[PDB]
């Protein structure tokens, strides 16, 4: 036949892999010791295009993007990752 290259071996390695193991664990000794951070992004926003950098409240008490809805009504069990429970 006309034959039937291919495409040279990846990129591997252990010690990229063993990297994330241990960083996950200095995550969680950081918290244990007293407190750090809660997210990659305290506020609200995740709006299209580009925006301005994630600049701290200033003594306001709440997420980044700015409440536009006057009238709320009342709204509950909305999270992700709801608190889970087994027998």
Do not use: C, H, Y
């Amino acid at each position: 036949g006309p034959g039937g290259p291919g495409g040279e071996p990846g990129k591997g390695g252990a010690a990229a892999a063993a990297a994330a193991a241990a960083a996950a664990a200095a995550a969680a000794a950081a918290a244990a010791a007293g407190g750090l951070a809660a997210a990659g992004g305290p506020g609200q926003g995740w709006a299209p295009g580009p925006g301005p950098i994630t600049s701290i409240p200033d003594s306001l008490g709440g997420p980044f993007a700015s409440v536009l809805s006057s009238l709320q009504r009342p709204n509950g069990a909305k999270a992700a990752l709801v608190k889970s429970s087994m027998f």
